[PDB]
Amino acid sequence: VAQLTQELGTAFFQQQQLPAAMADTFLEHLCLLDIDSQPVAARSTSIIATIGPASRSVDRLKEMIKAGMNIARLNFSHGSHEYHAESIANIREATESFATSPLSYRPVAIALDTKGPEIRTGVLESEVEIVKGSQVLVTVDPKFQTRGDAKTVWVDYHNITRVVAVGGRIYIDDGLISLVVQKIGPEGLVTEVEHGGILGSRKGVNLPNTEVDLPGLSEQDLLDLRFGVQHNVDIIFASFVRKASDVLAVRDALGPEGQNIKIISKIENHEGVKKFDEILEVSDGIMVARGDLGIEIPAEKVFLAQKMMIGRCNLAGKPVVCATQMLESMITKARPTRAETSDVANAVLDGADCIMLSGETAKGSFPVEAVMMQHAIAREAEAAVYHRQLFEELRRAAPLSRDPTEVTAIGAVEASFKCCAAAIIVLTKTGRSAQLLSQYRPRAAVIAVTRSAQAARQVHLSRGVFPLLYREPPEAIWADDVDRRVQFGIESGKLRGFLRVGDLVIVVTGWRPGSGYTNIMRVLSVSHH
Amino acid sequence: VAQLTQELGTAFFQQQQLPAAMADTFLEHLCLLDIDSQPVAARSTSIIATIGPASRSVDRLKEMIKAGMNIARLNFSHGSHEYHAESIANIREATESFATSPLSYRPVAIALDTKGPEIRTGVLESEVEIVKGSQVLVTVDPKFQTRGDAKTVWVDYHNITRVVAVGGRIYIDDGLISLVVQKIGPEGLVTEVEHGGILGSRKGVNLPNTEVDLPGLSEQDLLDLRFGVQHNVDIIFASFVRKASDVLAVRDALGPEGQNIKIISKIENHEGVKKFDEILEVSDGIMVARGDLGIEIPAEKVFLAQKMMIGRCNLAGKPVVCATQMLESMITKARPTRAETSDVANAVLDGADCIMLSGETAKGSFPVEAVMMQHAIAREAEAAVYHRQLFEELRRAAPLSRDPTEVTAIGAVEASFKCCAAAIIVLTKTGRSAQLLSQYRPRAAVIAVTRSAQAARQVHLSRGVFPLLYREPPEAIWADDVDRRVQFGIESGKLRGFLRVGDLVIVVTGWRPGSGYTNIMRVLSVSHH
Amino acid sequence: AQLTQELGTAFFQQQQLPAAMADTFLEHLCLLDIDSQPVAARSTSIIATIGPASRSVDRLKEMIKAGMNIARLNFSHGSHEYHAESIANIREATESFATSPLSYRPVAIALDTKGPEIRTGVLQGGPESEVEIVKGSQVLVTVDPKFQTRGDAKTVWVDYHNITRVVAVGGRIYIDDGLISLVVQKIGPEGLVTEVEHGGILGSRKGVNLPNTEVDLPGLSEQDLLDLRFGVQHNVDIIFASFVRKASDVLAVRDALGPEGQNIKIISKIENHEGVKKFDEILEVSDGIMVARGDLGIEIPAEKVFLAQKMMIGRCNLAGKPVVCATQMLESMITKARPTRAETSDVANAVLDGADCIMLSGETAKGSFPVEAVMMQHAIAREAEAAVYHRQLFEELRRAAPLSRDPTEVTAIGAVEASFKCCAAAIIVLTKTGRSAQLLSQYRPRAAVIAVTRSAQAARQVHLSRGVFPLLYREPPEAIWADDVDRRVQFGIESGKLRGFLRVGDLVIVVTGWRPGSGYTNIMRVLSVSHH
Ligand SMILES: O=P(O)(O)OC[C@H]1O[C@](O)(COP(=O)(O)O)[C@@H](O)[C@@H]1O
Ligand SMILES: O=P(O)(O)OC[C@H]1O[C@](O)(COP(=O)(O)O)[C@@H](O)[C@@H]1O
Ligand SMILES: O=P(O)(O)OC[C@H]1O[C@](O)(COP(=O)(O)O)[C@@H](O)[C@@H]1O
């Protein structure tokens, strides 16, 4: 390091947690972390924002995008087709409003989140108080579908009496209320309230440690997916995936016409956790859906499942998302808690490709500030990653490969470490080439230049890929068309402030048109032309 | 491992995250973590609970102690001597209520938390609304000491006009309200409200990135410390330590008569962080006081300072405490958020010796449940620690030593790993011998048998030390007195459920009476006598 | 390593590939396998000393086929014209193969300096009179020139004048392969009053060593100044500078090679304790190092030499400069067809230690099996090269090497990392000076670094760097520079194909630059070997 410190300035090595990057143990790494060491890199951890009343206006979205939202989540657990279709128009209006200047345009992906195997309570309307210590009944009786009170809950899962056990829990409304079952019979269940809040009407029920007969996709889901194809969505977040076949069902539904759509299976319960490896293998990636997961399993165990699934997805090289209550208190407050700040940082340090806002952006008072807070924590945490260890462990775990794109990608990432490259610039049609760079977690941003609008959107799922959408039509000479895409990477980089004159860039390209021929790594100096 | 699996049962190696313990990389470690793998060990991370209205009754304390409170924190920022003196009696009444049965008696330490260099607002009384966008004034004018409104704040730091800068912040009431200074003059400051809540009367002010002339100990502090000596407290949490001399001031105050009291310096601001190494060297340990720290420094950087200080304290072998908002939402709610759960786990995985509750126990609706939730997260996180790496890194970092107690301690911890010892049993007068075991972070509990009531209390600061207070008077033959203290460790272990017949224990003792002669490690089977 | 399905079960049996996949060095050792056959590409260079048994053009030709890469001219013996006869003989043997330039093996020529000598005077006149000395004795070492010929059993004179000053009371005086030791007792005006320790027979003008003494001689005799200038005249690739002791001795050789010899590669020979102590400063200003174990194992205890060897190979590996292991590697083979079990072991362990080259002295120069010596070193080195634990070596070198903004450095480590991901048969590099190939060498890839060059000198000099197989390209530039680049690469690959280094469906990493002239290497491509 003594020589770049005479060339790049003493202060270059004070930023990006570079003193901590050069440590020889994880422990020493931790000791050298410095609050005055400023993140300089662009932010690599994608932000996912749930659209709802607080974030659906075209002007709201424009501020979200400016703040750093990369992916928009449509939760089909609430709202009609036309409501969502309008969310989509407003998002594409906001996004496409920056097309004016191609060099600074930010692709925004749109993720459709399924309703999935849901269990709802009755019309019970307004609201009624439920009391801890107190005896509540659960019935499947179609007459009570319309009645309901502090003493009786109806629920639309007919066979509930066949699946629970004595001492098992029934949780209603995102786990707000807890009932312990004491007696099972064919008429219904007899329950004591363990946790008593105020019950609304047609709420969500969870039954931990049960096998519920509800099939892969409800009729409602089949429809919701065909909407997504019709509206050209980029990603499905598949709710409550329990086994592989559940993911295959989803793929079949999307059929030939939506085979390029990414399936992110949400692990929400003990079944998904247990069947995780088989879910991973057929999904495009994973969401640690900590909300359902923290009622389906004991709450003090969610961190184990989080770190497990993130690790296995890092090892598999498929994107993984951390979700739910990351900045919960910013629903009502403008500044998050010390534990929220911690949780966002620890999700990045764990190895998450994406972090997610729900309430915070859908309904809260501070949607834009939440996005801004995730963006600011993420940048700090990314630079505090111990790349030495991480890269070496990924290097080792990864199999040998005779695939030129794999070979090229690992040489390029190594190269970027050797010189502290400001960027790896890569041409990709499908995103694949950038993904294989991303899977080694380089410090250097992976600037992916593509003509596929859809690719530019989907690559937000892979940590460290900055998609640039290329709009100009083919030069006549292919080699020229290549240079210009590369030159567009650089100029965009310059304008967006990720690259400056004198920076080194690694440039990854291929020897002919089409997917699958990336085979070339160059080392260039950014220049003034 | 194939042989203990034929001896101890296949299922022994399914618990304590033992499959993950046997992994060869950190990454693989993470992948093997298992939500069905049950923590079996006792909980090693001490819990600190702030005493206040919700946790001051003798009956409340008894449930706190049962739930797992190890250290009681008296916050001298609120309350009079007689109020606190009564907190102390109630704590000692609760604690000493279990002396009935020596084999299950749990020492409870009492920590005195200083008021420290405080800056307070005026009598302003009741409450008044302060508004974002709006022009507020700060004055030192003794006339306004009694007035105050949505347009004027008084504050008792006379020289405030001499220490701030334009664009600097003034934060009032645990950072509830934020003012940006725009004009400085000798009469006062002119400020815009950035963050507007509701102001009370005589609240706390923070001035980030300023040097305030306020001396080491205020007059009030001198007194508060002499109370602590008089009331036999175990620990000082020294508020807002800024430099070493601040810690020496505290030690001088306690004078000869309180030289065995432990000083834990609270790092709350950019000055303490910068001067951390020199603070550590003279303190007995550290508190990451994330509350003040998250307003004194940018909030998105607290995790860097946390992980830094925890690492440096692990490396130094001195206790370190993580504090503030760990389970904040349990002030009003019975179940914490997914990020609170995360934060507690990540503080244990970071290497914290102690975790802390404030609001959650002092004033909230759910004091006992908060303690129970910290206890349950901590147990899970402790077993998910990657001991392979951690022990090796501590082994390496630690200097060579010709001190027999150091030598013995590292052999013993190695030994405990070889056999998955249920416990290391150690005789200590002062606690030192158990501390040097603790500093290598064994999986096996360090059961410390002592006659010093005060030691039994203070060793709660060191991760993994379970103090047992020994009450029987000296056998005539010293060797016999040793065996019996050791036999008391075992029986206590048996009764409390940390040891069973057939378990291996490492037993650490010394060759003569007095501190400093620990030099002996034995390997024993727990027996039926 | 599940890919096995495409390259065959067979592939992961060979090259010590199971031992390469071990997580620990101990597991690595455990998985070493005598049935796991090595590749043809042998990456550690053989320096053969040229003397009586290795001068015949027929023998040189055999020695080249056996796998000799550098030819050492020991200028301690032989005449200028003797040597020019050797040089011309070598060139003839080398150039006899230029006829098929796809299998042409460049052969470097190294000039081994005579350097600071210290000789004993004549014994009572006669040049074959052989005194004896008794152990518990008294002996005298003199400056005085009349004793030159008056050489008693009690008194001897020696070339080196300034011993009075430089050897102190207690210093040791070894004579003839350290057969005779003297502990210096008194620094008299007479000379040095010594006490014998070991004894035996004598002669006149036989080597003497000054253990732990800082030799006064300038580090270039007049004979060196003259041998060097001859070296420049005959276009030698490499100097082995004898008895290097400090940095100034290396600069003295660079000074004496002058502007005409700027591109001669200087390998400082570490022969003595002062050498070992000043090693780092010597290494800063040299292009490499010889571990000259002959003289070293007299000038320091024999049991300490493996320590000096291992330290110097490690420090050179760290610096990324070649290092030679020299002396008695196959001693027995002078007289016998086959080596001892300690000799093969010594060769394998030099390679596992990290030696860029291994040397044969008498085994090739004056001995009865020079061709089979070469063949032995060649066979052991291929087996030992595969038993290297690259996972740990590559990891340590990576971590030890500094960050660089030099695109050649950057490209190189990228290429080496790529080679490892896919078990590349080769890294094909274009280089004018050798530098681009050396910068690959430094990371010790398992794949052969096939260096394509038009520089005949570079192609020869590059044998110093482990794993670099030089090819000489003769064709004149194509019209279009890009077509000229591609033709060199193709030469590289077809050259490989002919020699067995490469087979169709192998991956290669191809390293090249963006424009002509040195220092512009900046491109790495992954390609398949073609013409299925
Ligand atoms: O990442 P993917 O989808 O394989 O795309 C990589 C491809 O992009 C290119 O660089 C350029 O291809 P196009 O000119 O066909 O867009 C190819 O050379 C390479 O194979
Ligand atoms: O941990 P410390 O304070 O050094 O105490 C260790 C001491 O305790 C003992 O085991 C027993 O000492 P006492 O019998 O004096 O309590 C000593 O042998 C040993 O030196
Ligand atoms: O190894 P060196 O001395 O830097 O030589 C490397 C040079 O070889 C090349 O591949 C070809 O250059 P030439 O055509 O000058 O031989 C250059 O692009 C590159 O800079």
PDB file of N, CA, C and O in Angstrom, chain B residues 401-420:
ATOM      1  N   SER B 401       3.044 -15.111  27.789  1.00  0.00           N
ATOM      2  CA  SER B 401       2.935 -14.780  29.173  1.00  0.00           C
ATOM      3  C   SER B 401       3.618 -15.842  30.011  1.00  0.00           C
ATOM      4  O   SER B 401       3.498 -17.003  29.729  1.00  0.00           O
ATOM      5  N   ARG B 402       4.331 -15.389  31.035  1.00  0.00           N
ATOM      6  CA  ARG B 402       4.962 -16.240  32.007  1.00  0.00           C
ATOM      7  C   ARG B 402       4.157 -16.201  33.311  1.00  0.00           C
ATOM      8  O   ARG B 402       4.574 -16.763  34.296  1.00  0.00           O
ATOM      9  N   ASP B 403       2.988 -15.558  33.290  1.00  0.00           N
ATOM     10  CA  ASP B 403       2.101 -15.565  34.432  1.00  0.00           C
ATOM     11  C   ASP B 403       1.323 -16.884  34.515  1.00  0.00           C
ATOM     12  O   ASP B 403       0.416 -17.115  33.713  1.00  0.00           O
ATOM     13  N   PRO B 404       1.537 -17.706  35.573  1.00  0.00           N
ATOM     14  CA  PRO B 404       0.921 -19.030  35.661  1.00  0.00           C
ATOM     15  C   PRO B 404      -0.603 -19.038  35.539  1.00  0.00           C
ATOM     16  O   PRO B 404      -1.171 -19.979  35.057  1.00  0.00           O
ATOM     17  N   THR B 405      -1.254 -17.976  35.968  1.00  0.00           N
ATOM     18  CA  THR B 405      -2.698 -17.918  35.926  1.00  0.00           C
ATOM     19  C   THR B 405      -3.168 -17.786  34.468  1.00  0.00           C
ATOM     20  O   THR B 405      -4.255 -18.256  34.119  1.00  0.00           O
ATOM     21  N   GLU B 406      -2.365 -17.104  33.647  1.00  0.00           N
ATOM     22  CA  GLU B 406      -2.653 -16.885  32.234  1.00  0.00           C
ATOM     23  C   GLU B 406      -2.451 -18.201  31.470  1.00  0.00           C
ATOM     24  O   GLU B 406      -3.303 -18.648  30.745  1.00  0.00           O
ATOM     25  N   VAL B 407      -1.297 -18.808  31.703  1.00  0.00           N
ATOM     26  CA  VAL B 407      -0.941 -20.089  31.149  1.00  0.00           C
ATOM     27  C   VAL B 407      -2.000 -21.140  31.488  1.00  0.00           C
ATOM     28  O   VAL B 407      -2.475 -21.832  30.608  1.00  0.00           O
ATOM     29  N   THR B 408      -2.360 -21.245  32.760  1.00  0.00           N
ATOM     30  CA  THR B 408      -3.296 -22.227  33.201  1.00  0.00           C
ATOM     31  C   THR B 408      -4.638 -21.990  32.501  1.00  0.00           C
ATOM     32  O   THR B 408      -5.301 -22.896  32.066  1.00  0.00           O
ATOM     33  N   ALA B 409      -5.048 -20.739  32.431  1.00  0.00           N
ATOM     34  CA  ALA B 409      -6.357 -20.401  31.906  1.00  0.00           C
ATOM     35  C   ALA B 409      -6.519 -20.803  30.409  1.00  0.00           C
ATOM     36  O   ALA B 409      -7.618 -21.197  29.962  1.00  0.00           O
ATOM     37  N   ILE B 410      -5.466 -20.643  29.613  1.00  0.00           N
ATOM     38  CA  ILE B 410      -5.577 -20.923  28.215  1.00  0.00           C
ATOM     39  C   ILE B 410      -5.543 -22.439  28.000  1.00  0.00           C
ATOM     40  O   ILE B 410      -6.235 -22.965  27.155  1.00  0.00           O
ATOM     41  N   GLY B 411      -4.760 -23.142  28.799  1.00  0.00           N
ATOM     42  CA  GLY B 411      -4.805 -24.621  28.747  1.00  0.00           C
ATOM     43  C   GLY B 411      -6.172 -25.175  29.127  1.00  0.00           C
ATOM     44  O   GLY B 411      -6.658 -26.132  28.569  1.00  0.00           O
ATOM     45  N   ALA B 412      -6.821 -24.525  30.063  1.00  0.00           N
ATOM     46  CA  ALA B 412      -8.058 -25.018  30.555  1.00  0.00           C
ATOM     47  C   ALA B 412      -9.140 -24.829  29.486  1.00  0.00           C
ATOM     48  O   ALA B 412     -10.044 -25.636  29.369  1.00  0.00           O
ATOM     49  N   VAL B 413      -9.099 -23.690  28.787  1.00  0.00           N
ATOM     50  CA  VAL B 413     -10.133 -23.335  27.816  1.00  0.00           C
ATOM     51  C   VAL B 413      -9.963 -24.268  26.616  1.00  0.00           C
ATOM     52  O   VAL B 413     -10.914 -24.801  26.116  1.00  0.00           O
ATOM     53  N   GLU B 414      -8.721 -24.501  26.220  1.00  0.00           N
ATOM     54  CA  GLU B 414      -8.412 -25.469  25.160  1.00  0.00           C
ATOM     55  C   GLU B 414      -8.968 -26.842  25.539  1.00  0.00           C
ATOM     56  O   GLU B 414      -9.681 -27.487  24.747  1.00  0.00           O
ATOM     57  N   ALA B 415      -8.712 -27.236  26.793  1.00  0.00           N
ATOM     58  CA  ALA B 415      -9.151 -28.496  27.295  1.00  0.00           C
ATOM     59  C   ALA B 415     -10.677 -28.604  27.184  1.00  0.00           C
ATOM     60  O   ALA B 415     -11.206 -29.627  26.800  1.00  0.00           O
ATOM     61  N   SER B 416     -11.381 -27.538  27.544  1.00  0.00           N
ATOM     62  CA  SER B 416     -12.825 -27.560  27.577  1.00  0.00           C
ATOM     63  C   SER B 416     -13.379 -27.763  26.155  1.00  0.00           C
ATOM     64  O   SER B 416     -14.500 -28.260  25.991  1.00  0.00           O
ATOM     65  N   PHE B 417     -12.630 -27.312  25.146  1.00  0.00           N
ATOM     66  CA  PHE B 417     -13.062 -27.429  23.748  1.00  0.00           C
ATOM     67  C   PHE B 417     -12.871 -28.879  23.280  1.00  0.00           C
ATOM     68  O   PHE B 417     -13.668 -29.405  22.538  1.00  0.00           O
ATOM     69  N   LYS B 418     -11.821 -29.525  23.767  1.00  0.00           N
ATOM     70  CA  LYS B 418     -11.489 -30.832  23.366  1.00  0.00           C
ATOM     71  C   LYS B 418     -12.612 -31.823  23.698  1.00  0.00           C
ATOM     72  O   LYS B 418     -12.777 -32.824  22.935  1.00  0.00           O
ATOM     73  N   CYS B 419     -13.363 -31.573  24.776  1.00  0.00           N
ATOM     74  CA  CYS B 419     -14.288 -32.576  25.318  1.00  0.00           C
ATOM     75  C   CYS B 419     -15.724 -32.039  25.422  1.00  0.00           C
ATOM     76  O   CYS B 419     -16.626 -32.728  25.845  1.00  0.00           O
ATOM     77  N   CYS B 420     -15.961 -30.826  24.937  1.00  0.00           N
ATOM     78  CA  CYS B 420     -17.233 -30.138  25.141  1.00  0.00           C
ATOM     79  C   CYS B 420     -17.607 -30.116  26.623  1.00  0.00           C
ATOM     80  O   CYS B 420     -18.707 -30.443  26.953  1.00  0.00           O
TER      81      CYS B 420
END
